Write a protein that binds this ligand. Structure first.
Ligand SMILES: O=C(O)C1=C[C@@H](OP(=O)(O)O)[C@@H](O)[C@H](O)C1
Ligand SMILES: O=C(O)C[NH2+]CP(=O)(O)O
Length: 427
């Protein structure tokens, strides 16, 4: 598709769609709890839809009526064998978290994904899961999808120290622990998004958090809840950047989740000297309105501890860095290579084809800033963030064109992206 270029101004209010991580979990917790669960303002991107259909395939009734999602919980030991293999689509969150969900399934199921998902390692989740008594295997020693999983009625509690800063592995193990008899202890390597921890408590469950050590007693019974999903910061991130780098711009992003384990981009924007104002803070829902204005930025260093707080924002931040004076280093971000695409190589190639000056490294990239961008053709390779990153970049192309192939990839997390972009070009 042809992307809009040489924008002269961006003004407007935007209510980004729901948080992907929380939406995924709302369905999982909704299915595992006893009673009814209603989810409001859920993200309807393809990844969340894949999660919902997976559970419907497992016998869970999930109705989407008049903008409200209603789930009829099945217990905690209530999922049933699916008629066909479970289609995880492009969702790594779905396959990894659900692998832990099915840890107690007394049947064998197959889980597959698209071309993108099929190249991603599941060993990080199969290894600990097998310690609990779950039988799981994929292709090659890295257990690439498709996977075959057979749970057990005799799940043993898990004692595992994560070797990587992954919230998905932590969450998969927590769902499994909820089904096992005994005390499980999960130790994070670095603090990662704590959405599973928050929601377990919201659905009546219990856990102990002592620093990076998470203790979960099993088995537990949960209760259906009313879940209101906040705007996804990862989605708002595209506009936070666009508002900072485009000329004569001021964007206001309302109802954006502000959980401390997800606000890495805010610290980066500050370090770089961007004009950011945070107002209308809701201390209970952890949401706020974020306002950005055209700014002159300076490069910064992005590493340790901060990575898991902005892991998904690195693609847009790289663009942000291309517009700052000086160098910006991103390291300790080896996890980028294993996402929907190798986001170190693809991001580097995409932006370099547009004005460049990004040097990819083994654990990240080094960007030398203040590049005037120009036209280019970019393929999404099935990664929604590459697409949206390129769209925002295109706005800065003064003269030339930008073709984005496989742009539908964006629908996995932000279907209404272009509608929002269009609403900002006139204001
Ligand atoms: O648990 C979650 O909801 C997520 C965890 C992250 O992956 P890792 O756990 O692999 O870092 C992130 O990239 C993904 O989009 C959402
Ligand atoms: O949303 C993102 O930026 C990365 N998601 C990875 P997944 O959810 O497929 O594991």
């Amino acid at each position: 598709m042809k992307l809009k270029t040489n924008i002269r101004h961006l003004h407007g209010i935007i209510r980004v769609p729901g948080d992907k991580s929380i939406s995924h979990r709302s369905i999982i917790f909704g299915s595992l709890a006893e009673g009814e669960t209603k989810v409001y303002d859920i993200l309807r991107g393809e990844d969340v839809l894949s999660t919902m259909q997976v559970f419907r395939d497992l016998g869970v009734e999930i109705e989407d009526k008049d903008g409200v999602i209603t789930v009829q919980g099945v217990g905690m030991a209530g999922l049933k064998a699916p008629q066909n293999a479970l289609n995880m689509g492009n969702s790594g969150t779905s396959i990894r978290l659900i692998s832990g969900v099915l840890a107690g399934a007394d049947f064998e199921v197959e889980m597959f994904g698209d071309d993108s998902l099929s190249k991603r390692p599941m060993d990080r989740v199969t290894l600990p899961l097998k310690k609990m008594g779950v039988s799981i295997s994929g292709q090659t020693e890295r257990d690439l999808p498709p996977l075959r999983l057979k749970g057990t009625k005799n799940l043993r509690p898990i004692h595992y120290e994560l070797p990587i800063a992954s919230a998905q592995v932590k969450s998969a193990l927590m769902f499994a622990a909820l089904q096992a008899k005994g005390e499980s202890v999960i130790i994070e390597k670095e603090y990662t998004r704590n959405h599973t921890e928050d929601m377990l408590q919201q659905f009546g469950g219990h856990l102990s958090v002592d620093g990076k050590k998470i203790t979960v007693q099993g088995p537990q019974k949960l209760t259906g809840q009313k879940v209101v999903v906040p705007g996804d910061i990862s989605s708002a991130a595209f506009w936070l950047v666009a508002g900072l780098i485009a000329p004569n711009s001021r964007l206001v992003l309302q109802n954006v989740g502000i959980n401390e384990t997800r606000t890495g981009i805010i610290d980066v924007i500050r370090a770089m000297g961007g004009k950011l104002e945070i107002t209308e803070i809701d201390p209970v829902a952890k949401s706020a309105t974020l306002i950005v204005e055209s700014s002159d930025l300076k490069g910064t260093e992005i590493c340790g501890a901060l990575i898991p707080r902005l892991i998904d924002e690195l693609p847009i931040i790289a663009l942000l860095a291309t517009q700052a004076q000086g160098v910006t280093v991103i390291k300790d971000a080896e996890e980028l290579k294993v996402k929907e695409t190798d986001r170190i190589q693809v991001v580097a190639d995409a932006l370099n084809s547009m004005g460049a000056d990004i040097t990819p490294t083994a654990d990240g990239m080094i960007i030398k800033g203040k590049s005037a961008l120009h036209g280019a053709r970019v393929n999404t390779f099935g990664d929604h963030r590459i697409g949206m990153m390129t769209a925002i970049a295109a706005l800065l192309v003064a003269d030339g064109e930008v073709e984005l192939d496989r742009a539908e990839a964006i629908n996995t997390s932000y279907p209404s992206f272009f509608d929002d972009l269009e609403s900002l070009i006139h204001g």
